[PDB]
Copies of this chain bind each other. A is one copy, B any other.
Amino acid sequence: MDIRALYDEKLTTPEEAVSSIASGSHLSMGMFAAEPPALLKALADRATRGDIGDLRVYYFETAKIAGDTILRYELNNRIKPYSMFVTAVERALIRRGIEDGGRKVVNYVPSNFHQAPRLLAEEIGIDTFMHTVSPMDCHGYFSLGVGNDYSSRIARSARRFIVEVNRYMPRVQGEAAAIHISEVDAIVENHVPLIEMPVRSAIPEYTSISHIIADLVPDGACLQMGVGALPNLVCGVLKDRNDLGIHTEVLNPGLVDLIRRGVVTNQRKTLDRGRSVFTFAMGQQEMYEYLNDHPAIFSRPVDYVNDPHIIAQNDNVVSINATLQIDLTGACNSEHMGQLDFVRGAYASKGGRSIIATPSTAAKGTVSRIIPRIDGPVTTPRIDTHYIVTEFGAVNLKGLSSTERALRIIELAHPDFRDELTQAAKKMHLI
């Protein structure tokens, strides 16, 4: 059982690692920070040379890594983006694609994040999976590090699995997170710091918002927080608490700070007791290092983590997410132009709470985020919404009539807009 022998046998450069990937096939890669820069650069340039064509890349959550390599607009005709969710990177691509004689450059695949493993593995098929990893330990194992999501399944379903060993990637314990060297097909090495999530400051409203939310957080709450400044800031108010759990889609700096403070203990959880569960992690270097070899952290695949039935097995689940607009019905919209699983789970949880939070206004006070009607397709439907919060307060929509709902939602609007909004509600016959 010589591991060092296999490693040196699979060790290679990006160029030959990616060389055998056929044209017309399906590739996928880790989410965000698990996107393998050297493997990707090697693939981009292979495409640039017109060496490979007709490659669909299926993925969730793209960053500049894939953005600046294999998803460059120029490569579009050879490496086709099948985005299962639109990021700023695809908004860039779509925009540039219209101002080019209205060509279609992004193929959107409509998908539930929690079904991604089944979709990619069984419905779509993935022939090549590529993922950054932590370095092979003494037992012959790499860790998927910050990723678990769908990767832990695709890494094994893909006919070929290629990993870019990066010492900067934390060794992270998780279900199927550890991968034996016999499970890997090729290895390139590339120790480079990991990409980061930008810290962005507390709007003054976040202060009042984060304080309404904390009183909505029960004893022994089991948290899921969205990535964002508001949620991060909310954890800042929870430094006060004890015995919180974590069962979250994304592990973020704010949550990790609660672990580091001994606030998060996971001793009240029914599932994964004693461990914080997330399906992937995003943050800054500080978070990344603190994750390495952490014994009270456990990544799980998304079809476990984001399964409402699983989420609801923990008592007092608290799910806190941001949206851009809330309407008077009051559905919610978080699209500029996944969390729903927790919206459902949190309410199903015994003593659970789903909280969708937002500033009532933007554009220095000129634009109301509380609107009459989302046009058109909402991200959280009106029948799913539980609690909503603005700096003007919180309301539980469940069981409210269209009338009760519009009235309480107006009260949460900026008073500057309460007038128009009451008028809009009257023409709509919401009231």
Contact = CB atoms under 8 A, between A and B. Distances in A.
Contacts of A97: 429
Residue among A124, A347, A377, A400 with most chain B CB within 10 A:
A377
B123 A399 contact: yes
Interface in A376-391: 376-378, 381-384
Q: What is the predominant secondary structure among interface residues of chain A facing chain B?
A: loop
Contacts of A397: 110
Contacts of A429: 97-98, 102, 104
Contacts of A384: 112
Q: How many monomers of this protein are in the complex?
A: 2
A384 B102 CA distance: 29
B98 A402 contact: no
Q: How large is the interface on A (under 10, 10 to 19, 20 to 34, 35 or more residues)?
A: 35 or more
A58 to B, nearest CB: 9
A309 B109 CA distance: 25
Given A309-B309, A377-B378, A429-B102, A401 B112 contact: no
A108 interface: yes
Residue among A107, A347, A405 with most chain B CB within 10 A:
A107
Contacts of A400: 109
A212 B431 CA distance: 45
A239 interface: no
Nearest to A122: B399
A184 interface: no
A124 B402 CA distance: 14
Contacts of A82: 401
Interface string A80-121: 001000000000000001100010100111111001000110
Given A377-B378, A383-B110, A429-B104, A123 B309 contact: no
A45 to B, nearest CB: 26
A381 B109 CA distance: 13
Given A309-B309, A378-B377, A383-B110, A119 B399 contact: yes
A13 interface: no
Given A124-B399, A376-B376, A383 B112 contact: yes
Interface in A359-384: 376-378, 381-384
Nearest to A82: B401
Contacts of A109: 399-402
Nearest to A431: B104
A403 B110 contact: no
Nearest to A402: B108
A190 to B, nearest CB: 31
A27 to B, nearest CB: 15
Given A98-B429, A102-B429, A378-B377, A402 B107 contact: yes
A402 B308 CA distance: 26
A68 B98 CA distance: 56
Contacts of A111: 383, 399
A297 to B, nearest CB: 27
A102 B107 CA distance: 45
A405 B399 CA distance: 36
29 contacts: A82-B401, A97-B429, A98-B429, A104-B403, A104-B429, A104-B431, A107-B402, A108-B401, A109-B399, A109-B401, A110-B382, A110-B383, A110-B397, A110-B402, A110-B405, A111-B383, A111-B399, A112-B383, A112-B384, A115-B347, A123-B396, A123-B398, A123-B399, A124-B399, A331-B377, A376-B376, A377-B377, A377-B378, A377-B381
Given A107-B402, A111-B399, 15 more contacts: A104-B429, A104-B431, A108-B401, A109-B399, A109-B400, A110-B382, A110-B383, A110-B397, A110-B405, A119-B398, A119-B399, A120-B399, A123-B396, A308-B309, A377-B381
